[PDB]
Amino acid sequence: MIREERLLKVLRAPHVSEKASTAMEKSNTIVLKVAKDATKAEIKAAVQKLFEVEVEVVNTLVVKGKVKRHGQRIGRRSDWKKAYVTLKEGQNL
Amino acid sequence: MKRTFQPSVLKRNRSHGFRARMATKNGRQVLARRRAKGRARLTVSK
Amino acid sequence: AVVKCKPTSPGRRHVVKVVNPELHKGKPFAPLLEKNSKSGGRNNNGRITTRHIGGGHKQAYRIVDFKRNKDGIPAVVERLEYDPNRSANIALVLYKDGERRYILAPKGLKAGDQIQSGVDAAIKPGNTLPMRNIPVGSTVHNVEMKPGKGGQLARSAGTYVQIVARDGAYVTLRLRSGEMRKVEADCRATLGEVGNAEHMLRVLGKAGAARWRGVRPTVRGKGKKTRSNKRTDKFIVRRRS
RNA sequence: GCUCGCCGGAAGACCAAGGGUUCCUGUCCAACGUUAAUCGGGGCAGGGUGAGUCGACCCCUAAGGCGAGGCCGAAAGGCGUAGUCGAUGGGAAACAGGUUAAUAUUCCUGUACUUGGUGUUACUGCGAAGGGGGGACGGAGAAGGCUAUGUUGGCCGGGCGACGGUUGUCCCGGUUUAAGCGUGUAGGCUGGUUUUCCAGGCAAAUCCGGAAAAUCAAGGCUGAGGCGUGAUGACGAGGCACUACGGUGCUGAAGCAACAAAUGCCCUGCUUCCAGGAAAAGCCUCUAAGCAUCAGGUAACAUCAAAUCGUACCCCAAACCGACACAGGUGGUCAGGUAGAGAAUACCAAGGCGCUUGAGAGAACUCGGGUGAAGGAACUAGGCAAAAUGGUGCCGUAACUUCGGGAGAAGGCACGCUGAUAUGUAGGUGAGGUCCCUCGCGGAUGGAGCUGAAAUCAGUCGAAGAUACCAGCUGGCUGCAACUGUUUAUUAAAAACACAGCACUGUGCAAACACGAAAGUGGACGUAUACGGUGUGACGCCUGCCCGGUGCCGGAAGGUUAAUU
RNA sequence: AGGACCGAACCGACUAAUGUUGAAAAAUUAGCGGAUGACUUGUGGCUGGGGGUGAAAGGCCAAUCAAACCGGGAGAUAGCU
């Protein structure tokens, strides 16, 4: 009951980092960058109906953009949400 | 000694916020003239 | 009863305390506490209009009934309470039907007394009945100026009004200020006189007594009458002397 | 890596406002750092903030804001009803241990807990924008118990000392363990149960309140803490095997007794007191219309969900406010050891630092300090600055006085350590056992070990025994002011201000006055023992005579006078 | 209980010195007062300039005040430099 296209568009792409790798090898957790709203229910539905795997708990956080001023030109980064997804049953990448 | 400027977002946005300014007609004229001038930030950016 | 505290130190070196043991000790009737606390003496605009006022200790307001519309229902007085709003004390009267209301306690009213209003109440202190049934020459308190309000005259401590004559539908009084006024006889009146009249004995001891009561200091900066009403001249007979 | 020093009721740690990525890793020294700058709060790239149990959010609320109708005003606009916003308060729930370079009560093992929906079981009177309970409240004081915490004893594992002794009443580190569950103690509060009736709680009500009777006086409510589970669990020094020298896996015993004790809890309590010390929602009971096989409510069962927002970093400073990486200011919580009256002062535990220019020289002079023979305010407008006492218990303590005070008046007595009284005294803390015992969170008992002052005698050390820091100089005369306090931020802190009391004057309630073209509000949800204005300023002796003129009160034979006709 | 005393945090700096182109456009050194109430403070709201407020100095209203800041009258006027 989460509709279509919305589930496909909610998530942007997975995130790769040392912490992400440690989480993957410790608790089989997946770190994703998702849309702005990116509600927990929408993320759950998208993961269930896209990766065909079960999700135990969904945790999300907002990462504030940085500043990369080039000299008298203050340009701030955009805003994106980081979500941690725990499967507990899927031994996939 | 305690200085004059004591930062407070609540006080600033309640004494010079967009809604507070627009509540009275005088603030509406202030906003209109600021828009005519072309100020990037009308009142405050929370 | 006044107790002269020993002059241990200035500021309560010369204080006079007005204590009265029979007054109830403890919390008041909670269901009768509401708003109208310390206002600060500031109008809606926010400017000073009654200068030398402000502050004061927090005080709750107790609803007190003056109409005495309950007629023919005897009530028993249970205790006496001190009302910070008014100098005079109040009496907690429980009606036979179960009503618990407050009323100014006269001097002759003690705990465990029967009070009944109406046109058939006996002529004894504490009762209330229309002035049309009040014998001439009997002192009164809580006098009413127009029926339906209840006791607009003589509400402060030790205030009494002596009836001199009726002279037709109206009735002529003599207020404590020393002036005779004509009032509608249908107005309700309360027999007896108000309670404790020892208000002047206390001297407040020190500055704090007046300061925390809500009175600010008066800062230094005659016979010009300013009475101009021209509507109650007929009602009033002669001014004070 | 080591030595020396400072803070350690902070110069430490945790939070909200504050700033918004300064936090970690890799890399560079042009400027940014008052100096070189491989370093950093500087530049570039990458990573980091995980919530039903934190808080916000959110239901209703105080001060206060907006304001449909409506009032007023030439209009902008002013007040204001229903209503709606508005915390600085109130409402549902979590901890032990571990983890990353950086995040945790958020992730991992466990015990758990609050709320809402879904369907089932059996029962049944359910249903408010209403009533009632409590929510729900002030200053001060205290005793009695308990907890964190600290100390001592045993125990666990390791030691025989770079130099005189150190197998022992010697040293080293530990002797830690949550939320929940049942017990409901110490303590506090309340008098209960049954039946009939009722001008009240806007109409009604089994509910509250009121009136009658029968019965008991033992029933109920609240209530820290300890107890067993929690936990045959976690942690644990120190050890046994693998190392990219950063680290990895396993093992692991004591983990108990006594004392002290808090600002923390019992306590939103107890006593006193005048200055009499908020509202609403959350929860429970009944009724209005309605429904009365329905729908709903009751306890259990299985399941679902608790959306969204910050979780880095400093938070008495290099990160906030002061133009600065500034001798300044910034709310709340944690509060160890030594001696001590303590949260001041002196040194230490964990923790953080030696403060962004250094080395020599050892002159005059400037700043802050140490001692100085003789005099001791003699200098100076001026005891200004400086110098001296400084505590404990005892003796003693004047004039006056409102009998409270003066007063710590002035002036003297002893202050270390050791032994005896008494191998450690009174007090307190306080285990077993006898007797019974609802028989255990029972009582008369009787001493284990610990604090041990205070008091007398004796011995001894030095010039000084409060020997450190900390810590009143002392009395008299005299003008001013009742005392305490308040302002001239930034030349005058008072002899100025007010101050408790007193005197005069005006105010009859739609009160006087003030804010306002005006609705309206303060006065006051008060009523001449109250309020407004003026003058003086506790207390004792008095406020005496005078109405020319100036303001005020009561008004009159009379002279003068506009609008108006 | 004490608008009590001695005395911490806290509260305005009174006194001599430093600083007077400072560390600071008002602080520090060492004494001094209150420190249970006429006390102080955090968080929100109100009193808006011929007005506010003021235990009264004609103080404060943003490092300023015997009348704050901004735009306009306004290139005010000036027998003055």
Residue numbers in the entry:
A (entry chain T): 1 to 93
B (entry chain 2): 1 to 46
C (entry chain C): 1 to 221, 252 to 271
What does the original paper state about this entry?
The E. coli 50S large ribosomal subunit is composed of 33 proteins (L-proteins), one 23S and one 5S rRNA. The 23S rRNA consists of six architectural domains that, stabilized by the L-proteins, define the shape of the 50S subunit with its three protuberances. Here, we present a biochemical and cryo-EM based analysis of the earliest period of 50S assembly, utilizing an in vitro reconstitution system with purified rRNA and L-protein components. Taken together, early 50S assembly occurs in a domain-wise fashion, while late 50S assembly proceeds incrementally.
To differentiate states occurring during late assembly, emerging structural features such as the central protuberance, or helix 68 were added to their names (C-CP, or C-CP-H68). Subsequently, state C transitions via intermediate steps into state C-CP-H68 (48S). Next, H68 can form upon integration of bL33 and bL35, while bL35 rigidifies the CP. In addition, the fixation of H68 seems to involve contacts with uL1. Furthermore, the L1-stalk associated H75 and CP associated H88 provide RNA contacts and stabilize H68. Accordingly, late step 1 assembly terminates with the “48S” particle C-CP-H68, sharing most structural features with a mature 50S subunit, but lacking a properly arranged FC.
